[PDB]
Design an enzyme around this catalytic site. Structure first.
Site, mmCIF file in Angstrom:
data_model
loop_
_atom_site.group_PDB
_atom_site.id
_atom_site.type_symbol
_atom_site.label_atom_id
_atom_site.label_comp_id
_atom_site.label_asym_id
_atom_site.label_seq_id
_atom_site.Cartn_x
_atom_site.Cartn_y
_atom_site.Cartn_z
ATOM 1 N N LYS A 10 -90.956 67.461 -24.499
ATOM 2 C CA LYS A 10 -92.239 68.036 -23.592
ATOM 3 C C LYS A 10 -92.899 66.480 -23.303
ATOM 4 C CE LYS A 10 -93.218 71.901 -22.370
ATOM 5 N NZ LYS A 10 -92.331 72.746 -21.596
ATOM 6 N N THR A 57 -88.330 73.189 -24.957
ATOM 7 C CA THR A 57 -89.536 72.296 -24.856
ATOM 8 C C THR A 57 -90.851 72.971 -25.212
ATOM 9 O OG1 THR A 57 -89.512 72.307 -22.717
ATOM 10 C CG2 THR A 57 -88.180 70.433 -23.399
ATOM 11 N N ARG A 176 -112.144 28.578 -12.402
ATOM 12 C CA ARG A 176 -111.686 29.765 -11.623
ATOM 13 C C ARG A 176 -112.153 31.061 -12.384
ATOM 14 N NH1 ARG A 176 -105.258 30.750 -12.984
ATOM 15 N NH2 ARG A 176 -105.481 31.057 -15.370
ATOM 16 N N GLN A 228 -101.049 32.322 -20.778
ATOM 17 C CA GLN A 228 -100.269 32.087 -21.766
ATOM 18 C C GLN A 228 -100.919 31.330 -22.954
ATOM 19 O OE1 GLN A 228 -99.797 31.218 -18.383
ATOM 20 N NE2 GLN A 228 -97.820 31.276 -17.833
ATOM 21 N N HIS A 256 -106.077 38.298 -9.083
ATOM 22 C CA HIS A 256 -106.422 37.140 -8.633
ATOM 23 C C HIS A 256 -107.645 37.403 -7.768
ATOM 24 C CE1 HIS A 256 -102.910 35.262 -9.799
ATOM 25 N NE2 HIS A 256 -101.976 36.088 -9.144
HETATM 26 O O1 LIG Z 1 -103.022 31.135 -16.049
HETATM 27 C C1 LIG Z 1 -102.031 31.345 -15.141
HETATM 28 N N1 LIG Z 1 -100.748 31.095 -15.634
HETATM 29 C C2 LIG Z 1 -99.696 31.069 -14.733
HETATM 30 O O2 LIG Z 1 -98.336 31.117 -15.097
HETATM 31 C C3 LIG Z 1 -99.950 31.132 -13.345
HETATM 32 N N2 LIG Z 1 -99.146 30.653 -12.210
HETATM 33 C C4 LIG Z 1 -100.077 30.727 -11.256
HETATM 34 N N3 LIG Z 1 -101.442 30.866 -11.706
HETATM 35 C C5 LIG Z 1 -101.540 31.068 -13.141
HETATM 36 N N4 LIG Z 1 -102.279 31.310 -14.039
HETATM 37 O O1 LIG Z 2 -83.173 73.499 -18.742
HETATM 38 C C1 LIG Z 2 -83.966 73.358 -19.536
HETATM 39 N N1 LIG Z 2 -84.011 72.960 -20.877
HETATM 40 C C2 LIG Z 2 -84.609 72.920 -21.905
HETATM 41 O O2 LIG Z 2 -84.453 71.788 -22.661
HETATM 42 C C3 LIG Z 2 -85.735 73.816 -21.791
HETATM 43 N N2 LIG Z 2 -86.695 73.692 -22.762
HETATM 44 C C4 LIG Z 2 -87.618 74.894 -22.297
HETATM 45 N N3 LIG Z 2 -87.115 75.118 -21.087
HETATM 46 C C5 LIG Z 2 -86.057 74.379 -20.710
HETATM 47 N N4 LIG Z 2 -85.158 74.085 -19.644
#
Ligand SMILES: O=c1[nH]c(=O)c2nc[nH]c2[nH]1
Ligand SMILES: O=c1[nH]c(=O)c2nc[nH]c2[nH]1
Ligand SMILES: CC(C)(C)/[N+]([O-])=C/c1cc[n+]([O-])cc1
Ligand SMILES: CC(C)(C)/[N+]([O-])=C/c1cc[n+]([O-])cc1
Ligand SMILES: CC(C)(C)/[N+]([O-])=C/c1cc[n+]([O-])cc1
Ligand SMILES: CC(C)(C)/[N+]([O-])=C/c1cc[n+]([O-])cc1
Ligand SMILES: O=c1[nH]c(=O)c2nc[nH]c2[nH]1
Ligand SMILES: O=c1[nH]c(=O)c2nc[nH]c2[nH]1
Ligand code: NA
Ligand code: NA
Ligand code: NA
Ligand code: NA
Lengths: 295, 295, 295, 295
Positions: A10, A57, A176, A228, A256
């Site tokens: 879930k 689920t 910059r 970097q 940018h």
């Molecule tokens: O900090 C930066 N790292 C990069 O790799 C990069 N390339 C363009 N502009 C950049 N700026």
């Molecule tokens: O098709 C389904 N598979 C599941 O595992 C499930 N669990 C609740 N409802 C469900 N439906």
């Protein structure tokens, strides 16, 4: 054909919890979004229409709420470890549980200079997250992160000295804007199980706080040679302050802000030292990633 | 057939501006998204393919940037008034300009307890907005707002005494969660033109601050009988503190947090006084609106 | 202070309905999102904490589902009229009901060349919408629309002859890309009540179909002088084909695709007649609006 | 500390291309979003502020556009292979290129029953994607996918026979709605390089078409025992029809539609065989995943 991998569960389970101090009247709230996916001896649900192996689920959803009622939800590393451990212990045929948690901010309001006992504000979409993989026979693997921490500095960022060839148009710059959305992840040493996770509980909030403080101070104070170079300094300081993490990973967009040449209009000067008004660019964006470990 | 209404222009214009104090080194940043739509003697662009009457939307974009270079961008009420006035004065055949501005937060960082001279954080997606309608012969109509202010209180909200009939299933409650996204708008007295807007400039930031402070204090301190009752108290206090606004409007979702009955599981008690874990509901949601004026 | 305007209700109510033909086995599905906001003698809920005048928003939600069970949900103009009429007839003190409906596409699948009896695909996020305002003593005001109809033509769009001054940089063009997201709304004659709406029921789907067909054919076949000129032709044809609509409104973004000059790289020619590769621009965007009525 | 992993480049690069047949007048359009991230001997950019090893992300952007001008952009598997090969061949110190492409739909319009030469519609947000990893010394690893294919069937879905214990509340059902957003990925055999990719070019569009046709026919015609069982049948048929794929992966949400008990209102019957009106649930959702390979 045959099933090579499978997991199910879930996703997008929203959860709130409140703590009420009845002696002081102070309430504290927690809110998260949870995903739990299970693995195990489930292949026949896929190949033979055998639903006997499926923990529904819906039942996984119920279990999330029950676990939150009966256990602490903070720190999220602990809650996710409790929740994942439950599935592999309760169900013989379930052998891994993958728990992802996104924690949402609810910061206590200050009203006329005093903290309010039960009112909160969403100060930002910054999240604190965990990924907890509980694997029977292998322990608990935890990745912790902060994400959505959006920052900007208006100077003390540079980018010069990069490779130049027949594909290159970008001008070098000594001043910059630098703006990013910080995604920082720290990978813990493998834990043998829930007892070992519990033994380290104070370290989780402490390390999140250190990561956040290091990120912000280094961003603010580094006269940055590149994204970097600055991200590496962050990672190395976090590793130096918590022996129980093995790696630190950053993923940083370079969002940018382009200069706007206005000199075609009445000679207006808006570039270089005269740059005042910029065009923030939504796309494209640089994307810079690093994983740093210990030598 | 005939054109009954028309407007056109440029939307989603992102704009950044920096102010640099070279004596103190302190920098301050502003970022907005702007829309400008024009009205006037433009019908023949629609009916006769006559583009001579069209100020190109690209040119409107250029004008936004030029205006930001040559004028203050704060308060946004002022910037929008300057920008809209420009179009009706520059172009004889343009008779209204509709300027919408969304202001994005860039809050100065505090590093080791001291404000940093040039580093900022997006603390929240809360926006400060304006809608400025500059209408030749009619003056300047300004609506100011805050939006995206997301709050939650964990108690001191009630909802009982509502109408009950054959469509009603909702239980009365004397203690619930209340959470909303605040959208609050204040409508200024009509201004005769840009000079009158300039004469009131300190009132714009002051009134935004008052609206925000009243919203938060009233949310936090009202033991709320309904969203309706609490929002009215906010509006009446804002009107009492600024004579130059005519109306205050709130639009508030009721972002429901549902109790989760767990008593089917081992008798667990999680309702009423025992309610700890809740299910936040994404949809549906109540939606409550009010416009308050003076008697 | 006093309440000048107020409305409240339930938003974001998702609704599905199925029709099953048991003689043929053919099933048909409908899915919508509904909002209902009520007006009337409700001011004391705001000013005096008097909840007796409030039909709870939860009850409004229940009523939407009950109304869908007992009545046709198509055409949406009819369903919204039924739903809004209910509130003003059931509750003496409620004097207007504002019903917004978004209809989601579920198009029957064709499998090996034959329509499938019970399987559907979301072909596009295009929506069919209605806004139905049921006002006691004033009748029923209906606006119908299509939205999210995203189209592109690769030639037979032009834009030249626009105003040029010291703010203008845009080059004239005799061949450009034109792409938009169509939002088209038709405003019906006021209906006196639900009986009159029922009397015109076949016209609602017919007119939606005509609006869609006119939009697509005119977009595809007009050698467009501007967005303005092309949208007017659409509106005039729709008015000519349905006497019971009073106005047609379009709101169209101009989603720009920019040429990319590559001649700095090995003399590559990618502009003008040689233009092959373009940069779609996410923002800013032109925004062009018109309301067309009859002379 | 030391760099354990690093990659960087340009994300969110929007690209359009047109093909014009001047003998027939028929135009065809292609639109994509591209990401390119590079790996290699780049660690000193992080640890020593050495930008000499950085191919600027702006230059990567330029290269995407140049590559699209000089080469086919379809099938995307080919374009991504061309683009990634370029970086590892052009730059001695770059040893991997990771290319992600999202292809957007522009389907030719039919106007009065005839295909239009230059007008297109976005029929759905369904995407066709590729992930192309070009690794020096290791070849080219391609994953192809379709995503965002949103479907619903109104009957011929069941879910019974699942595990029941003290966490289980879900009722068994022999007739439910099933709706999902299909994400289906096929993993190709490793290719030794660009020549081998070129040798298989007709297989890319053919296999995408087969995957889509199998998905839709199996969804529509399987009287489904579970999402698990139905997705496995899809995967096994795709593997049987293309020997050059090694695995097929599905990731399917179960987007729940809940029955609405209305019997509290005038005894209305809306459950079981009488179920007509349902509440689509936005969250939570089941999430079911499988990777199928050959035995
Ligand atoms: O900090 C930066 N790292 C990069 O790799 C990069 N390339 C363009 N502009 C950049 N700026
Ligand atoms: O098709 C389904 N598979 C599941 O595992 C499930 N669990 C609740 N409802 C469900 N439906
Ligand atoms: C991902 C979904 C939609 C389930 N979600 O978590 C939504 C959500 C979480 C927290 N707040 O404040 C608003 C919405
Ligand atoms: C509406 C659009 C997309 C133009 N926008 O304003 C985007 C935007 C504004 C501010 N920040 O921080 C991020 C994105
Ligand atoms: C606006 C909300 C979130 C309530 N909504 O209608 C969501 C929604 C509607 C239809 N489909 O297919 C998916 C989601
Ligand atoms: C991811 C981003 C924002 C770069 N994008 O690809 C946007 C986009 C692509 C295609 N269409 O039609 C609209 C927007
Ligand atoms: O504060 C509230 N106002 C209402 O109108 C409402 N209806 C249901 N729940 C409600 N809450
Ligand atoms: O069709 C168009 N209409 C306009 O108003 C406009 N302005 C710039 N580009 C334009 N295109
Ligand atoms: Na187990
Ligand atoms: Na004028
Ligand atoms: Na009435
Ligand atoms: Na190389």
């Amino acid at each position: 054909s045959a099933v090579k991998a499978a997991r199910y569960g879930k996703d997008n389970v929203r959860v709130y919890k409140v703590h009420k101090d009845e002696k002081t009247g102070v309430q504290t709230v927690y809110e998260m979004t949870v995903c739990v996916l299970l693995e195990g001896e489930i292949e026949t649900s896929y190949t033979k229409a055998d639903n006997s192996v499926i923990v529904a689920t819906d039942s996984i959803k119920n279990t999330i709420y029950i676990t939150a009622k009966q256990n602490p939800v903070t720190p999220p590393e602990l809650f996710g470890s409790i929740l994942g451990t439950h599935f592999i212990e309760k169900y013989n045929h379930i052998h891994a549980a993958h728990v992802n948690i996104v924690c949402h901010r609810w910061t206590r309001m200050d009203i006329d200079g005093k903290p309010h006992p039960h009112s909160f504000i969403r100060d930002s979409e910054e999240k604190r997250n965990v990924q907890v993989d509980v694997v029977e026979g292998k322990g608990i693997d935890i990745k912790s992160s902060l994400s959505g921490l959006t920052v900007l500095k208006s100077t003390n960022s540079q980018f010069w000295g990069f490779l130049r060839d027949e594909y290159t148009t970008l001008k070098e710059t000594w001043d910059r804007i630098l703006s990013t959305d910080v995604d920082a992840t720290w990978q813990w040493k493998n834990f043998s199980g829930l007892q070992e996770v519990r033994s380290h509980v104070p370290k989780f909030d402490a390390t999140w706080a250190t990561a956040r403080e290091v990120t912000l101070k280094t961003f603010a104070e580094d006269n940055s040679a590149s994204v970097q170079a600055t991200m590496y300094k962050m990672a190395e300081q976090i590793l130096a302050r918590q022996q129980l993490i093995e790696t630190v990973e950053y993923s940083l967009p370079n969002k940018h802000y382009f200069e706007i040449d206005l000199s075609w209009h009445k000679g207006l000067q808006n570039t270089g030292k005269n740059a005042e008004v910029f065009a923030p660019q939504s796309d494209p964006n640089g994307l810079i990633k690093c994983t740093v470990g210990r030598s």
